[PDB]
């Protein structure tokens, strides 16, 4: 029904008024002296419910309705498609002051610039003429449904054909909760907070909420038969009446779901925790509140009167865990996250690269809020001016596309770009400036206490000897990095594994003639691990980074 | 007579499908529960999913799964190959598909299966012709509209889901996307048991070792291995028996007994179809062919064989293993020969790539090729990848003032992100060999990319003696000759000299 | 022949492939030789046209699919296998790829005997020296 | 001629070659002349257009295949032999690579005598000195 749709109260009211007033009391329109339009378009991302709302309007309205669809108009017999559309319009007029709905107009709108066939051009012209031929007293409105607004014949945008359009965008989080509730009345609800589920759900739109609900219901059903051991013989009524989808089902469904827009750009589920990132406590806190304020308190930003910063650059020497911070943020952000690697976007075909940048940023804007992590931004941000002829200006085109798409982030949709480079000396001076990419976080070499924190964070899962003292290690290792400590720990683990395998083969020979002789790592393992331990830090690189930081 | 018997064994039941227990069970629920216990879906209130997308590398049994489900379910089944729908006549392909869907709905509740959707869902935005775009629009309309679906489910099969229109990958049209990837060792064990229970094998059959030693075979690959082994056994026995075109006695038909020699020979002459494009014939180098480097040989052998043979211990401590290693020293010391030896004895897969081989005159194909190679390496893991002369492909980014078009810098950035990025980093080991370690970028030599910097110094007198024994291990020699003099006289020479 | 199937009509090439395979199966237990596959397998990734990928999908369906093959064996010939779709290089579609490389001196001697059996040679000629001195001849 | 067979339309250049060869073998024992093959022989590895590979494969099939030729001979013409696919420069397709370089001074005299037999010049002028002065002038 009309109330069945939801989440777009303003647009539903607009369309309802638009469809009812010229259909309930068209006489008042004549009295006022306005000719109501005949064509009305709605355009939006896939799954927004445009077809749903059109079907509900067809249902809630008592007036007669007719459905047309793009791909079912053309036919093998010559000239019979145009006659089909013509007779459709004649019946639409002859029967009653009805309402006609054309689905997926984009199939019948090739922009007439790439359109080459003669039958398609003829059908487009016939429909244009018929639309223009709809007099004021036609008293029948046509409703067009386009998925993408750019691939539209501009002739159809002229007054008298399609003047009123509605960009039905992704609903608000509160609207998303309302839609979830719409889905949540029919099913059997457990005793327990959809408001939290919507406040945590960020990118999902319309059908995605339905997908989440269905997935949770399926999980609930899945637990029930396996425990009940229900077979093909029959169903047990005691199971049927004892059915309620709980909070854990929704947790599972959210953990197994992703927005349909991001279905292509899904990412491998690598798990990191805030205690895994040893050290960098102030960095971790500042990043977390900077990400938490625009996504939880938009009113607070308005009260402050200054919109938040958008870009940020993590820089430092490698093995300082910058990618680890990226992983941790991707794991605990309560928002969408798209990881992007530099050379991936480039394409040999002329223009395609910038097209890829445009579409990726289109998804980034669609699944707002989002966090686009550009790893190794240098590959893109190569400084230029003396390159002359080499790549073919295509790199310059890519840099220009990125620059124009980085300053064009309005207050709405709040998309944060995370940069990560090892050598900031090669970045273009344009991009580093405020207004397009402002924030610059520096990851220095870990402090000795931070070094101890990192060491303890890396051996969280490793069983360890009771009498193990790490303060000595810290006092010895002064200029090392997290990767170096990881290497030391892996060397110790490999030594322990070698000893365990030696003992196991000795025990197997004994059998031929506790299970783990070393259930944890030993001090001798650390002694041998530090015998082959070295630092990858280049003192000259350290000096260069220090000089650059001073220049900052 | 035989027709009835043939039909019974012809159908491949769900037991035939193996190694994909979780995904097979999930799809079996999705297909059966609304056709076995629909009442629960009326009682709970919600409708079941009515769309599924199978995706994964080829030969993964997805078509086998389609045949198995078709044989198991008694409901109506409609089969549509992807390109089959189109026709020369204008506006008939969509008419044909509409007629198919109408027939499917008219007869009974049914399962439609559309194979190779990648040819049929070109995303409707990058194509220039309109016939494809209108076919996509017609499919989208049938999946979404007045009476979008009426107690009929649609199964699709694809190899490149990322080249599909996003609207087709949406809930309501295709609700669940199943990812049927490479089977695990246990999965390969069940697949072997499935493929080895039909024919007659000798008592020496032991499938566990075969499943352990196979590293990247998926489905049809394993089947191929089995077939090859059997054929080799037939060649072992079709030689001793004469041509005898008229008829063959039972005694040769009986007591066939595909021996373990057949299985091992067929595994040595086979490789996964994924690496079929990149692999080349490899020369043979024994461990005794490599003189000296005893500690280095043992270190590399244990560092490669431990994750592949002892993964339980790694999970006991819950720590990841070391992956990379870089040998450096004067040329001809035996580094490339050592790499060849590692290729010859180690069980893990070997990917030999030359240094400047992968560079391209076009724009971006260097990094695209790097990504393709690394995807292949991580797909058929465990793998060993040898990067010969890293100083050819790896340099300090931006060092060369003269513009190269940024290719080298972008390549090095691709390498950096692949060795340290949003990677899974399961079972890929990078081996480097360069005799000028000053030209490599300082980031590559970092731990987590290349943690082991191994110097290969010059051999000593005892190592020169060991090398002499290794290279004089075949040619006949003088009984009265003692090489101790040769060692005492060679001081600065190398193995090649 | 390889490019023999491609046509201006949309989809007719795949229709021709269907007709070929159905006739091959309808007639007898046959052997089907498809020549020069390097033009009908551009990896589906470097190419940009639509008809060729559609043909590749049709071929992949023909080689493997519902009742893919019964008393039909497919042999193919090509000069470059690396420019071929991996989906065609799997068991069930193309089980085994045989290589035909450079013959040795003995191989050259049999080829010479084959090629020198019908003309009137002199009595002072020998094929051993010819097979030895010939090095890179492909037969 | 070379570029006149190429057709941007899918699967039509191959049809043109098919009709050309069918007519060539239909009529009588025939001599064929394919001008400027370098426009139809990009070696199948450098260029990215699939149409060139397809036409090369079709030409190879026509020049080599099951019951390829009957009483006909094919001749080619090119300015850039080094930029040709090696599969086209094989025995059984194009075995004799004949070269045509600049003629000698005697060649210049012969060409002049060919040119100056239908016109009418003066007695005083001789062609031997004229041929000697024309050093590199060809054809």
């Amino acid at each position: 029904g009309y109330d069945d749709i939801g989440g777009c109260r303003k647009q539903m009211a607009q369309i309802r008024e638009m469809v009812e007033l010229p259909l309930r009391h068209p006489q008042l329109f004549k009295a006022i002296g306005i000719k109501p339009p005949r064509g009305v378009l709605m355009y939006g991302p896939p799954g927004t419910g445009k077809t749903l709302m059109a079907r509900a309007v067809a249902n809630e309205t008592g007036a007669f309705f007719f459905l047309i669809n793009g791909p079912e108009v053309m036919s093998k017999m010559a000239g019979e498609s145009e006659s089909n559309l013509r007779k459709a319009f004649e019946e639409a007029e002859k029967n009653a002051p009805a309402i006609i709905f054309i689905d997926e107009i984009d199939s019948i709108a090739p922009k007439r610039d790439k359109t080459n066939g003669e039958v398609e051009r003829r059908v487009v012209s016939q429909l244009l003429t018929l639309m223009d031929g709809m007099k004021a007293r036609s008293n029948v409105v046509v409703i067009a449904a386009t998925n993408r607004p750019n691939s539209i014949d501009p002739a159809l945008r002229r007054f008298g054909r399609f003047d009123r359009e509605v960009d039905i965008g992704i609903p608000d989080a509160t609207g998303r909760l309302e839609v979830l509730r719409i889905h949540t009345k029919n099913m059997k609800l457990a005793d327990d907070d959809l408001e939290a589920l919507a406040a945590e759900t960020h990118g999902y739109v319309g059908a995605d909420i339905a997908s989440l609900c269905s997935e949770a219901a399926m999980q609930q059903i899945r637990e029930k038969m396996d425990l009940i051991d229900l077979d093909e013989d029959e169903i047990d009524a005691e199971v049927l009446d004892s059915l309620g989808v709980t909070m854990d089902n929704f947790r599972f469904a959210l953990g197994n779901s992703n927005p349909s827009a991001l279905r292509e750009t899904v990412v491998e589920s690598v798990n990191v925790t805030w205690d895994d990132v040893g050290g960098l406590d102030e960095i971790k806190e500042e990043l977390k509140e900077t990400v938490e304020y625009p996504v939880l308190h938009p009113d607070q930003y308005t009260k402050f009167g200054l919109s938040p910063s958008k870009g940020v650059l993590f820089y430092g020497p490698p093995g300082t865990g910058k990618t680890l911070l990226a992983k941790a943020v991707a794991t605990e952000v309560s928002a969408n996250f798209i990881s992007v690697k530099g050379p991936e976007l480039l394409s040999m075909w002329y223009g395609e690269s910038e097209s890829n940048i445009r579409d990726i940023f289109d998804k980034a804007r669609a699944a707002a809020p989002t966090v686009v992590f550009l790893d190794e931004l240098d590959s893109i941000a190569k400084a230029r001016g003396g390159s002359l002829g080499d790549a073919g200006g295509a790199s310059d085109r890519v840099v220009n596309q990125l620059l124009t798409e980085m300053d064009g982030m309005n207050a709405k949709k709040n998309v944060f770009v995370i940069g990560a480079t090892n050598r900031p000396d090669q970045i273009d001076p344009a991009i580093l400036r405020p207004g397009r990419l402002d924030q610059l976080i520096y990851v220095p070499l870990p402090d000795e206490n931070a070094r101890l924190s990192i060491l303890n964070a890396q051996l969280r899962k490793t069983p360890l000897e009771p009498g193990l003292e790490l303060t000595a290690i810290a006092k010895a290792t002064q200029g090392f990095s997290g990767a170096d400590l990881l290497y030391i720990v892996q060397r110790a683990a490999k030594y322990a594994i070698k000893d365990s395998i030696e003992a196991h083969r000795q025990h197997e020979a004994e059998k031929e003639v506790e299970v783990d002789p070393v259930p944890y790592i030993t001090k001798e393992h650390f002694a041998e691990a530090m015998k082959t331990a070295k630092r990858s830090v280049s003192d000259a690189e350290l000096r260069r980074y220090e000089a650059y930081s001073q220049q900052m | 007579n035989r027709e009835d018997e043939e039909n019974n064994m012809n159908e491949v039941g769900y037991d035939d499908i193996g190694g994909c227990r979780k995904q097979m069970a999930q799809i079996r629920e999705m297909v059966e529960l609304p056709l076995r216990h629909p009442q629960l879906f009326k009682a709970i209130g919600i409708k079941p999913p009515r769309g599924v997308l199978m995706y994964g590398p080829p030969g993964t049994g997805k078509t086998l799964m389609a045949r198995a489900v078709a044989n198991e379910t008694g409901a109506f089944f409609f089969l549509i190959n992807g390109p089959e729908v189109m026709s020369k006549m204008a506006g008939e392909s969509e008419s044909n598909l509409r007629k198919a869907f109408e027939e499917a709905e008219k007869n009974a509740p049914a399962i439609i299966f559309i194979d190779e959707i990648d040819s049929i869902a070109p995303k409707r935005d990058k194509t220039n012709g309109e016939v494809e775009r209108r076919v996509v629009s017609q499919l989208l309309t049938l999946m979404d509209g007045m009476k979008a679906r009426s107690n009929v489910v649609v199964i699709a099969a694809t190899n490149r889901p990322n080249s599909i229109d996003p609207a087709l990958r949406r809930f309501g049209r295709f609700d669940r996307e199943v990812d049927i990837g490479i089977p695990d060792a246990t999965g390969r064990l069940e697949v072997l048991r499935i493929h080895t229970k039909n024919m007659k094998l000798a008592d020496d059959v032991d499938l566990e070792a075969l499943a352990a030693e196979t590293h990247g075979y998926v489905g049809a690959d394993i089947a191929s291995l089995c077939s090859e082994a059997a054929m080799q056994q037939i060649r072992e026995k079709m030689d001793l028996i004469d041509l005898d075109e008229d008829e063959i006695d039972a005694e040769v038909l009986d007591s066939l007994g595909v021996t373990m020699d057949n299985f091992r020979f067929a595994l040595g002459n086979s490789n996964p179809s994924a690496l079929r494009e990149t692999v080349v014939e490899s020369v043979n180098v024994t461990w005794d062919d490599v003189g000296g480097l005893d500690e280095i040989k043992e270190e590399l052998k244990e560092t490669v064989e431990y994750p592949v043979l002892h993964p339980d211990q790694y999970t006991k401590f819950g720590l990841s293993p070391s992956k990379g290693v870089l040998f450096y020293g004067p040329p001809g010391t035996g580094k490339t020969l050592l790499a060849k030896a590692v290729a010859t004895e180690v069980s893990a897969n070997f990917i030999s790539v030359k240094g400047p081989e992968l560079l391209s005159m076009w724009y971006g194909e260097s990094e695209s090729n790097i990504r393709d190679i690394f995807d292949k390496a991580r797909a058929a893991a465990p793998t060993v990848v040898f990067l010969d002369e890293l100083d050819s492909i790896a340099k300090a980014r931006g060092g060369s003032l003269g513009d190269a078009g940024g290719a080298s810098d972008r390549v090095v950035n691709q390498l950096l992100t692949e060795m340290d990025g949003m990677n899974a980093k399961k079972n890929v080991f990078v081996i480097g060999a360069t005799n000028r370690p000053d030209q490599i970028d300082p980031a590559i030599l970092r731990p987590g990319r290349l943690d082991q910097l191994i110097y290969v110094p010059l051999p000593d007198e005892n190592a020169r003696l060991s090398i002499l024994n290794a290279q004089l291990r075949k040619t006949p020699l003088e009984p009265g000759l003692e090489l101790t003099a040769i060692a005492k006289a060679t001081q600065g020479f190398s193995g090649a000299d | 022949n390889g490019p023999e199937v491609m046509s201006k009509m949309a989809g007719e090439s795949e229709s021709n492939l269907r007709k070929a395979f159905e006739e091959a199966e309808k007639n007898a237990p046959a052997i089907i030789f498809i020549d020069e596959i390097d033009s009908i397998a551009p990896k589906r990734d470097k190419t940009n046209g639509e008809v060729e990928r559609r043909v590749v999908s049709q071929l992949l369906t023909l080689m493997d699919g519902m009742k893919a093959r019964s008393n039909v064996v497919v042999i193919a010939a090509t000069n470059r296998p690396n420019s071929i779709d991996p989906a065609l290089r799997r068991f069930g579609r193309f089980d085994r790829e045989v290589d035909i490389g450079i013959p040795d001196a003995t191989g050259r001697l049999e080829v010479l005997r084959i090629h020198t059996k019908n003309m009137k040679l002199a009595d002072d000629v020998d094929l051993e020296a010819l097979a030895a001195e010939t090095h890179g001849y492909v037969g | 001629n070379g570029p006149e067979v190429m057709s941007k339309m899918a699967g039509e250049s191959e049809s043109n070659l098919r009709k050309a060869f069918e007519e060539a073998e239909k009529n009588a024992p025939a001599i064929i002349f394919i001008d400027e093959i370098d426009s139809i022989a990009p070696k199948r590895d450098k260029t990215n257009g699939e149409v060139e590979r397809r036409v090369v494969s079709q030409l190879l099939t026509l020049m080599d295949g099951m019951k390829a030729r009957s009483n006909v001979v094919v001749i080619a013409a090119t300015n850039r032999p080094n930029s040709i696919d090696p599969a086209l420069r094989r025995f059984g397709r194009f075995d004799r690579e004949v070269d045509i370089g600049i003629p000698d001074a005697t060649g210049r005299l012969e060409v002049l005598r060919i040119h100056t037999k239908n016109m009418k010049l003066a007695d005083d002028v001789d062609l031997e000195a004229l041929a000697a002065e024309t050093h590199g002038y060809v054809g």
Binding site: - | G129, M361, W362 | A10 | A10
Partner: peptide, 22 residues
């Protein structure tokens, strides 16, 4: 009666060059 047809004409590529300075 009418009929449809497929068509694939060409595309546009970009090359990469190397320079030498002094």
């Amino acid at each position: 009666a009418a009929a449809a047809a497929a068509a694939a004409a060409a595309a546009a590529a970009v090359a990469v060059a190397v320079a030498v300075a002094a």
